[PDB]
Motif scaffolding. Structure first.
Motif, short mmCIF file in Angstrom:
data_model
loop_
_atom_site.label_atom_id
_atom_site.label_comp_id
_atom_site.label_asym_id
_atom_site.label_seq_id
_atom_site.Cartn_x
_atom_site.Cartn_y
_atom_site.Cartn_z
N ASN A 239 0.79 -1.12 0.01
CA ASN A 239 -0.05 -0.14 0.06
C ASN A 239 1.06 1.35 0.07
O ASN A 239 2.21 1.16 -0.03
CB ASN A 239 -1.02 -0.02 1.07
N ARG A 240 0.47 2.33 -0.15
CA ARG A 240 1.18 3.41 -0.07
C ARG A 240 1.53 4.22 1.06
O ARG A 240 2.17 5.23 1.20
CB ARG A 240 0.45 4.62 -0.98
N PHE A 241 0.97 3.84 2.25
CA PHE A 241 1.16 4.48 3.60
C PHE A 241 2.34 3.83 4.08
O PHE A 241 3.21 3.49 3.61
CB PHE A 241 -0.24 3.82 4.77
N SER B 63 2.85 -1.88 5.22
CA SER B 63 1.91 -2.78 4.35
C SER B 63 1.58 -4.09 5.34
O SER B 63 0.49 -4.71 5.31
CB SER B 63 2.74 -3.24 3.32
CL LIG Z 1 3.36 0.72 2.55
#
Ligand SMILES: [Cl-]
Length: 299
Positions: A219-221, A265
């Motif tokens: 994910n982008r976090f 992630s």
């Molecule tokens: Cl991430």
């Protein structure tokens, strides 16, 4: 992405069988010493509450039958070092490899040459659980088998199997006879305590999944170490330390995914599950590859 065991040749020529009374088990023949679990000297009655010092005094050299393949090794001495018995024999093993004795940390991995009555049957890659047990049904018949790592040319012996706890889990010692964990070589009620998931190993395995094309879970976090560890504690994952971040360095460098990125992630996978998908062909997160393991088996 397969578990890899170290090649077992250097250990195979060290494996002998040790019999005392009705008990036969495996022993490790290095130079002119055979190491094995001291519980070999116990009868079934002895195991309930053994006084090993008193028991060992009753035994004589001829009470120990040692055999390597065919030749049977005359025991010329018997000594106890913590929970390992040291049977001195009158022949140095000609197949003795360069070796060292090391004590490993919870979460580290090693190879076990599983043996029955001195004879090598197969090799297994395992991990020392956070609670200092070893998962692995093969250890049931393999008392005295040893765990090892090969570091350059030297076999580093790290484990010797001693027993099953009443729950069935497996427990043992380093090669100087100190148990891993709070266990004693006595047949009595003993609890291993909560096992947890080896977080840094899960992260290493997620990097391997990225290196092998499997990347849907990115994910982008990002996250901070403190926020991640709050989530981790909830799911019985071991806390992640800054040392674990540093150890993961090479994998972040190769992939371009910062460690705390990958932690974000993992947090999402812990909170949401995999929704029926797999990673590296697994439906559950794998925690028995160390960061070194993944580095070694990628390039
Ligand atoms: Cl991430």
């Amino acid at each position: 992405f397969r578990k890899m065991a170290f090649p077992s040749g250097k250990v195979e020529g060290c494996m002998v069988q040790v019999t005392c009374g009705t008990t036969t088990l495996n022993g490790l023949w290095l130079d002119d010493v055979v190491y094995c679990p001291r519980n070999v000297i116990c009868t079934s009655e002895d195991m309930l509450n053994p006084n090993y010092e008193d028991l060992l005094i009753r035994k004589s050299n001829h009470n120990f039958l040692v055999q390597a393949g065919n030749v049977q090794l005359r025991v010329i001495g018997h000594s106890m070092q913590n929970c390992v018995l040291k049977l001195k024999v009158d022949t140095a093993n000609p197949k003795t490899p360069k070796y060292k004795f090391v004590r490993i940390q919870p979460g580290q991995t090693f190879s076990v040459l599983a043996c029955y009555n001195g004879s090598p049957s197969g090799v297994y890659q395992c991990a020392m659980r956070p609670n200092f047990t070893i998962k692995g049904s093969f250890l049931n018949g393999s008392c005295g088998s040893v765990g090892f790592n090969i570091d350059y040319d030297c076999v580093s012996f790290c484990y010797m199997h001693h027993m099953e706890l009443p729950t069935g889990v497996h427990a043992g010692t380093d090669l100087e006879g100190n148990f891993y964990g709070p266990f004693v070589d006595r047949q009595t009620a003993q609890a291993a305590g909560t096992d947890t998931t080896i977080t840094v190993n899960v992260l290493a395995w997620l990097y391997a999944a990225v290196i092998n094309g499997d990347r849907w879970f990115l994910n982008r976090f990002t996250t901070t170490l403190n926020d991640f560890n709050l989530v981790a504690m909830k799911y019985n994952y071991e806390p992640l330390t800054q040392d674990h971040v540093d150890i993961l360095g090479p994998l972040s460098a190769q992939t371009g995914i910062a460690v705390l990125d990958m932690c974000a992630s993992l947090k999402e996978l812990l909170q949401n599950g995999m929704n029926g998908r797999t990673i590296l062909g697994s439906a559950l997160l794998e925690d028995e590859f160390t960061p070194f393991d993944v580095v070694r088996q990628c390039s």
